[PDB]
C-alpha cells in the first residue's frame, strides 16, 4: 500500500482563482462564505491513485480516431503535447492526464449543450493518456471553436480544452483549462479572469509549436503543466 | 525569498465535465475501462456500504452537475494506490449527481482507522474533492460516520475545526437503503449549515 | 457609356508586395524581370464595370446556407463585415466584393487540393455581395483553418479568406487576403511577408468585433478595405 | 508631405482562385448569374472574334492556373460599364486557363478606337489583368491586333514603350479557328520575349 | 542497419546564409536561381554515418604534434573545446568533428594558396575527433592569422577555423567557420555577412575560456555547436 | 510560439576544404584511415558501378574545387550506418573534383529500393551534398539512374518536382568505362539545365 | 479587437431625483405637461388596471425614495412610442414611492402578448427600471401577472431564469381595490425573495 513519505508545497490561493469571482455569475452561489480550514498533511492527503494498470484503448489519446463513424472530424488538426513537472522542476512520470473539449464549431457532445452549431458525427471530444517516464504527454485532436454561454448577454469562451491531471497525490490533483496563443477572446473571458494575476493567466496559454508539427498533416501546440512541489519530510515529531 | 515555479492555476471543470470524466452521464459511449463509483467488488473484506448525497448551492438549490472524486483506506486502514479494475478493492473512485434528482452514489466498504503524521488515530473517513460549474478550484472535504461517535470526538482533524457545531457538517447519517447499510452525506457549499472545506 | 472624369492616386509598389519575393517560391518564375512601363491614365484605365444589375442569389453572401446539403457546416460561425473606402476616406458604394476560403479544417473545395483534412458536405467556400450605399459589406461564414502547402518543408498559411474588390475602375480593382487577429502563423508566412512593410501587413488583419456579434449564435470580425484615392481632373491639356 | 490613407496591399489570388471567381473550373456548381468569357451575344454589332492564349513562366512552362480579367470598348469605341447578362455587349469579362492544355478563350467583338486624355486616338486594344499563384500583385497588359498595323504604329501608349522590339509582345496574331476569325495572344511573364506590363 | 525513427526540425534558411550574397563575389555564379524543392523526411534523410569505429591516430586532435618535422609550430598555443548539442539541448555524443585552418600567419598548407606569408614546417592545419559520451570535443592548435583574399580590393578574413560536424544524420551535417572573440575583422567580412541576422553571426564567435587554459602553456577558446533538433515520429500514416 | 535553440549557421567550406576533408587532393600526407570514394570492396554483393561527374557554375565553367558527400543504401535497400574501413560496404563516402579536369569519381554498388515514410517505393538513388567556395550552405541533390526509367517515373520524390523537364536533371547516364558499368552525373548549379536541389 | 466610444457611465439618481423627474413629490410646482403614472385614459381599449407596490432593501426596510420608469405594450401587444398627453394610451410612464407609506401606483391597461425575436410569445409583462439613492446603475425587471399562470409557464424570458423559485419574484398578485382590478408588485432589492433583475 501507499506510504506517507512526502510533503507538498502549500498552494498559493491568490495565484489560483478565488472561489468568489462574481463576473463569473455561477460562482456567486457556489463559493463558500466560510474560510477554508487548514489541516496538516497526513497519509490521507499525501497519497493518491496510480493508474499504470488502467487499460487504455489504442485511440484513447487520439480524438481524430476515437469517435470514428465513417470519417475524419472536420477542423484544424493539431497535436497537443507538453511535460508535467512539479514546482521543483521534477518530471511527473506515469501520471493520468485527461482532456475534453467541444468540436470545431464550439459544440459539446453532451445532452445539456443546445448551442445551435452542429455536432460533428466523427468527433467525440474526450481523450486520456499517461505521461511517459520523462513526464511527457501527447494528444491529437481538432482545435475547438469558441463557445457562447449565458453569463453576460454576449459572452464567449475562447477556444479551450479542459485538462485533469492526477499527479502523485490527491493534494496535487488539478483540473484546469488550456487556451491558445493569440486568441483575442482570452482577455475578455470572465472565467479566465477568475484568475486575478495576469502572469498566472499566461501559464494557461498553449504556444504554437511548429517544431512538433507534421508537415502537410497537422499543427501542434505545447502546454506544460506544473503541479505542487514534492519534498521529503524533515525534522518531524522531534 | 525562494520562489519555485508557480503551480498551473485551477479553472472550473464546467457543466460538461462528464464528457471527459463521467462518460455515461454525458449521454455518451463508455470505453472498455472507466474509473467510476464502485470501489469494492462484493467479495472484498470489510463492511459493505452504500454512500449517497446531494449538493446544495447558497440559495438552497440542488447542484445537479457536480463531479466528485474520493480517496479512502480499505477496511484494514491501508491506502491502495495501485488502481486496477481487477482489484477486489480500490481506494479511489468517482461519482456525479444525476441531472434529474441530483443524487450521487458510491459503493464501497467502511474505511479502517489511519494515523496522522504525529501517530494519532484519525476517525474513519473518506476524502472528497468536489468539482462543478461555478467552482473555480475544487473543494476538499471529509465524510465521517455517525456510528463512530467515540472516534470522531477524538479525531485530530475534526478537532482543528474551531466551532464544534461545524464538525457536525462532516458526519454522514446511517440509514438503510433496500435492507442494506447506507450513509447519507449532503454537502452545502454556502450559507446555513455550510460544509467545512479544507486547505492542505 | 462610361466617361473619363477622374484620376486615381498612383499605387505605392513598395507598400504592396513586390513581384519577386523568393521565400514565396512560386514568385521566382512568375515575376517579370523587366521594369513595368508607366502610362498616363486614360478612359481605358479610369473606368470599369458596375455590377448593380448583376442578379445575386438569396444566399450568395451567406456561406452557412449557400452550399446546403442537409445541414449546417461545422466550424466557428462568424460574420465578416467592414467598409470599403478610398484613400481620401470616401465610401465606395454599390461595389462588387467577392470572397473565397477553405473550410474549418483548411481544405478547399477545389479538385487540385489534396490536403488530407476532409471536405465538409455543407460547406462550399464562396461568397459575393455589393457594398451598400454607405460602402458597407457583410458575409456570414465559418472561420477557415490553416492550410499547409509545399513551399518550405513545414509551411502553413494562417487562417485566411481571399477578397476581390472591383471598385470604380480597373485601376482600383484588387485581390488581397484577410487574416485574423492574433493568429501566431501570420509572422511566419512567406506570402504575408511578400509585403515588406510591417505596417502594411497590419492592414490585412481583421479584428474581433464583439459589437457586431449575434449572442448565442455567431462571432464577428471587421475588415475594412481602402482602394486608391479618386479625384477630379484639374488643369489638363492647358 | 500630404499622406493619404494607405491602400490595402495586394496578395496573390492563389491556386484556388477559381473557387471564388471561375466556379466551373474549380469543379463546382455555378450560380444563376456568373461573370464569364462571353462579352458579346451573337447579335451584338461589330466584328465577332475569338480570342485565345497561353501564359508562360520564366522557365518557359505553362501557367495552368491563370485567372484573367478584361476590359474593352464596344465596336463603336465606347466603354459599357452597366454590367448585365441581358446586354448584347458587356465591356468586362473573365477567363482562366484550362489545367490540362493551359489555354484561355474569350468571345467578343473587336473594340473600336478610343482617344487618350490628350485627344490622341489609341489603337484598338483590350485591357488585361493577370492573376495567379506566385503573382503577388496582378499584371496589367494590353492586347492589340496585328491587322491594325497603321493604328498600332501611331498609338501613344505603344509609343511609350522605349524599345520597339518590346512593342511586338502586345500584338495578337490573326488566325482562323473553325472558319471563324481569331487572335492568339500569348503572355510570357518572364525572360525571352517577356510581355510588356504596365503601371498606371 | 539504420532505421527511420526520428524527425529533424526544419532549417531556418533566413538564419543560415542565403545562397546568393553578392558581396561574397564567388557566390553570384555558384548559387541556384530556382527555388529549392522541399521533400518530406524519409530514411534516406534521417539516417547517416556513425564514426565510432573510425580509427583515429594518437595526435589527430592535436595540431601542435600532428605535423611534427623537428619542432613545435610557431604561434599562439590554444585549446579549442566545446559541446555539440541539438536544438532541444540534447548532447550529441560520439559524433565526428573535423577542423582545418591556416597557420599563425594566415597561410594554408594547400598547393593553391600562394599568399606570401610563409608556411610553418611544423604545422599542417587539420584535426579530427569524436565528441565524448557527453557531447564534448577538444582540439589543441595554434590561433590562425587573418588571410587576405581576392574578393574586394582589400578584403581580409578574420582569424577562423573551419568545422565540419556529422551529427546523427545527413540532415544534421554542417560545415561552418569559428571566429574569435573581439576580432575587429569580423564585422567587415563579406563571408561573415552572408549571414543576415547579427544574432546568428554571434553564434559563430568562440569565447576566450580562461577556465580551460593550461597555465604557463596554452590559452583556450570555447565554441558550442547546435545541430537540428531531433524528435521521435508521431501520428504518421494515420 | 515555441522557439528552440537556434542551429549554428552554415558558412562556405572554402577553396581549401581539401586540407581538412580530402587530404590527398590538398597535396598533403594522409592519415592511416581516411573517409574517401570507395564505398564497396570488390567482394561486396550487388552490381559494382563507377560514378563520375563534373560540376558547373552559372557561367558554364567547371567548379574545380568542389567537395561531395554521398549517402546510399546497400544492394538490399538498407542503409549501413556503422562506418568501418574493414566493411565490404559502407553507405557513406566522400569525393572531390580534380583541379585539372574537374571530375569526381566514386566506386560503389547500385543501391536497392527504399520506401518513403508513407511506404511508397523510391527509385534507386544516391543522396549527395555539395560543398565549395561560393556555396554558403551545402546543396542537397539525388543521383538517380537512367536504366531505372520505369521506377523513376513512379518515384514519389521525383514526383514532387512540379515540372517533368526538371526531373531529367537528376538522371545519371549509363555508359561503359574500361569495360565496367559507369554512370555520369553532372551538376549545374545555376542557369540552363540547373540541377534540382532539395530542402528537407 | 474593435473598441467603440465608451458609453457615459451611470451614477445614482440620488435622494432628490424627484425635483427633476417627479416634481409633485419633491414638494414643487409642476409644469403644464408632465410624464407621470397614468398610461391610460378612461377611454383606452383594454382591461383597465391599477398597479401598486413597495420596494424593500436588504434589511427588509422600505425604500421610500425610489423612482420607477415603465414601458409596456397596449392591449393589442403593440408598443406605442409616440408619447403625447393627448393619447388615450401611452406605452411609457413614471411613478415614485411615497416618503410616508412608500407605495407607488400606476394607472394602465393590461398589456397584450408580444413575441420575442425568435417568434415565441412572451407572457403579458410590464418592463420596469428602478432608480434610487444607493442604486449606482438602474435595475431592470419585469412585472408579470398571476392571472396569466399558463402563459407565464411558457414565457421564454421567465424560462431563462434557471431556478423556478426565482420566477415567482416576478409575478404580481391580483386583488380588488375600491372595486377595480389591481395587482401588487413588490420588489426586494436584496436578500430573501430577492427580485430577479435583468441585463440586456
Ligand atoms: Cl452525431
Ligand atoms: Cl462533399
Ligand atoms: Fe467549456
Ligand atoms: Fe489559400
Ligand atoms: Fe579560409
Ligand atoms: Fe446630489
Swiss-Prot record, chains A, C, E:
PROSITE patterns: INTRADIOL_DIOXYGENAS. Pfam families: Dioxygenase_C (PF00775), PCDO_beta_N (PF12391). Binds Fe(3+) ion per subunit. GO terms for biological process: 3,4-dihydroxybenzoate catabolic process; beta-ketoadipate pathway. It comes from the Bacteria. Pathway: Aromatic compound metabolism; beta-ketoadipate pathway; 3-carboxy-cis,cis-muconate from 3,4-dihydroxybenzoate: step 1/1. It catalyses: 3,4-dihydroxybenzoate + O2 = 3-carboxy-cis,cis-muconate + 2 H(+). Keywords: Aromatic hydrocarbons catabolism, Dioxygenase, Iron, Metal-binding, Oxidoreductase. Fe cation binds at residues 108, 147, 160, 162. Its cofactor is Fe(3+). Belongs to the intradiol ring-cleavage dioxygenase family. The enzyme is an oligomer of 12 copies of the alpha and beta chains. NCBIfam families: protocat_beta (TIGR02422). Plays an essential role in the utilization of numerous aromatic and hydroaromatic compounds via the beta-ketoadipate pathway. This is Protocatechuate 3,4-dioxygenase beta chain.
From Swiss-Prot, chains B, D, F, G:
Gene3D superfamilies: Aromatic compound dioxygenase (2.60.130.10). One of its GO terms (biological process) is beta-ketoadipate pathway. Belongs to the intradiol ring-cleavage dioxygenase family. The enzyme is an oligomer of 12 copies of the alpha and beta chains. It holds the Pfam family Dioxygenase_C. Pathway: Aromatic compound metabolism; beta-ketoadipate pathway; 3-carboxy-cis,cis-muconate from 3,4-dihydroxybenzoate: step 1/1. It comes from Pseudomonas putida (Arthrobacter siderocapsulatus). Binds Fe(3+) ion per subunit. It catalyses: 3,4-dihydroxybenzoate + O2 = 3-carboxy-cis,cis-muconate + 2 H(+). GO terms for molecular function: ferric iron binding; protocatechuate 3,4-dioxygenase activity. InterPro entries: Intradiol_dOase_C (IPR000627), Intradiol_dOase_core (IPR015889), Intradiol_RC_Dioxygenase (IPR050770), Protocat_dOase_a (IPR012786). This is Protocatechuate 3,4-dioxygenase alpha chain. Its cofactor is Fe(3+). Plays an essential role in the utilization of numerous aromatic and hydroaromatic compounds via the beta-ketoadipate pathway. It is an enzyme of class 1 (oxidoreductase). Keywords: Aromatic hydrocarbons catabolism, Dioxygenase, Iron, Oxidoreductase. 3,4-dihydroxybenzoate binds at residue 133.
Amino acid at each position: 500500500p501507499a506510504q506517507d513519505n512526502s510533503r507538498f508545497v502549500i498552494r498559493d490561493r491568490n495565484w489560483h482563482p478565488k472561489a468568489l469571482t462574481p463576473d463569473y455569475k455561477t460562482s456567486i452561489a457556489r463559493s463558500p462564505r466560510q474560510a477554508l480550514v487548514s489541516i496538516p498533511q497526513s497519509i490521507s492527503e499525501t497519497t493518491g491513485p496510480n493508474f499504470s494498470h488502467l487499460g487504455f484503448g489504442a485511440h484513447d489519446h487520439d480524438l481524430l480516431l476515437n469517435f470514428n463513424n465513417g470519417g475524419l472530424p472536420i477542423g484544424e488538426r493539431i497535436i497537443v503535447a507538453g511535460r508535467v513537472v512539479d514546482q521543483y522542476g521534477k518530471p511527473v512520470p506515469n501520471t493520468l492526464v485527461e482532456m475534453w473539449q467541444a468540436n470545431a464549431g464550439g459544440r459539446y457532445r453532451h445532452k445539456n449543450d443546445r448551442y445551435l452549431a452542429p455536432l460533428d458525427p466523427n468527433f467525440g471530444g474526450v481523450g486520456r493518456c499517461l505521461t511517459d517516464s520523462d513526464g511527457y504527454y501527447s494528444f491529437r485532436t481538432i482545435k475547438p471553436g469558441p463557445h457562447p454561454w449565458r453569463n453576460g448577454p454576449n459572452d464567449w469562451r475562447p477556444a479551450h480544452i479542459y485538462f485533469g491531471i492526477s499527479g502523485p497525490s490527491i493534494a496535487t490533483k488539478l483540473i484546469t483549462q488550456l487556451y491558445f496563443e493569440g486568441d483575442p477572446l482570452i482577455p475578455m473571458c470572465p472565467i479566465v479572469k477568475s484568475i486575478a494575476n495576469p502572469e498566472a493567466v499566461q501559464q494557461l496559454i498553449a504556444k504554437l509549436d511548429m517544431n512538433n508539427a507534421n508537415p502537410m498533416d497537422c499543427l501542434a501546440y505545447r502546454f506544460d503543466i506544473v503541479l505542487r512541489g514534492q519534498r521529503k519530510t524533515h525534522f518531524e515529531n522531534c | 525569498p525562494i520562489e519555485l515555479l508557480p503551480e498551473t492555476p485551477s479553472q472550473t471543470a464546467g457543466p460538461y465535465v462528464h464528457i471527459g470524466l463521467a462518460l455515461e452521464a454525458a449521454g455518451n459511449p463508455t470505453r472498455d475501462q472507466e474509473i467510476w463509483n464502485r470501489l469494492a467488488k462484493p467479495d472484498a473484506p470489510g463492511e459493505h456500504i452504500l454512500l449517497l448525497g446531494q449538493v446544495y448551492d447558497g440559495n438552497g438549490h440542488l447542484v445537479r452537475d457536480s463531479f466528485l472524486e474520493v480517496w479512502q483506506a480499505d477496511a484494514n486502514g491501508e491506502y491502495q494506490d495501485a488502481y486496477n479494475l481487477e482489484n477486489a478493492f480500490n481506494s479511489f473512485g468517482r461519482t456525479a449527481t444525476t441531472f434529474d434528482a441530483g443524487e450521487w452514489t458510491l459503493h464501497t466498504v467502511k474505511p479502517g482507522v489511519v494515523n496522522n503524521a504525529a501517530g494519532v488515530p484519525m476517525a474513519p473517513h473518506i476524502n472528497i474533492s468536489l468539482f462543478a460549474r461555478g467552482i473555480n478550484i475544487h473543494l476538499h472535504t471529509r465524510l465521517y460516520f455517525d456510528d463512530e461517535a467515540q472516534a470522531n470526538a477524538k479525531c485530530p482533524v475534526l478537532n482543528l475545526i474551531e466551532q464544534p457545531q461545524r464538525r457536525e457538517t462532516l458526519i454522514a447519517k446511517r440509514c438503510e437503503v433496500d435492507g442494506k447499510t447506507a450513509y447519507r452525506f449532503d454537502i452545502r457549499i454556502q450559507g446555513e449549515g455550510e460544509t467545512v472545506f479544507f486547505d492542505f
